Amino acid sequence: TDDDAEAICSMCNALTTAQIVKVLNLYTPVNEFEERVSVSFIRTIQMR
């Protein structure tokens, strides 16, 4: 959710934006229940 995006933006003080987008995009669902990050989330993080 976008609320998750805002909470992320709150806790991303130290890391640079490029590092943040890299780490969030390169996450992969190791197990079945979790689900892959959606492109809209990347966009929201980038513009935020």
Binding site: N31, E32, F33, E34
Partner: protein, 147 residues
Amino acid sequence: DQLTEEQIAEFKEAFSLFDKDGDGTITTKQLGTVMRSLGQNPTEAELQDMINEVDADGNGTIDFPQFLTMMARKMKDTDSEEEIREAFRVFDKDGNGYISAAQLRHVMTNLGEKLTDEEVDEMIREADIDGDGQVNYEQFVQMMTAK
């Protein structure tokens, strides 16, 4: 099936525990709550199965004899605690018998039937589980399924 008289009296007592409507017949909405409070665990999909089987009339409140019959069928097949212990030890990876509270909370919230975060938080709060330090699942399983 066979149902003892004390069991029938307890079923009557539970049949209107939250019958704030005053009808005297518990609704299917809290029916699963009734069974869970009565010591036997019905699956939510199974709970919907019973609801669909019984609510064919569309009344919304289960009849008492139907509830007793399905309860007798429930006690016909009782889940073993050792099965839950095997599942918990399977979930743990290190084999130390301790599982991270955050990991278990995440597993409960995400996989399968969603569990409200407040339910999980109350589960840790009651079971003296520590978030930072992994807590043995064996003692918690024993205390919950003391039977």
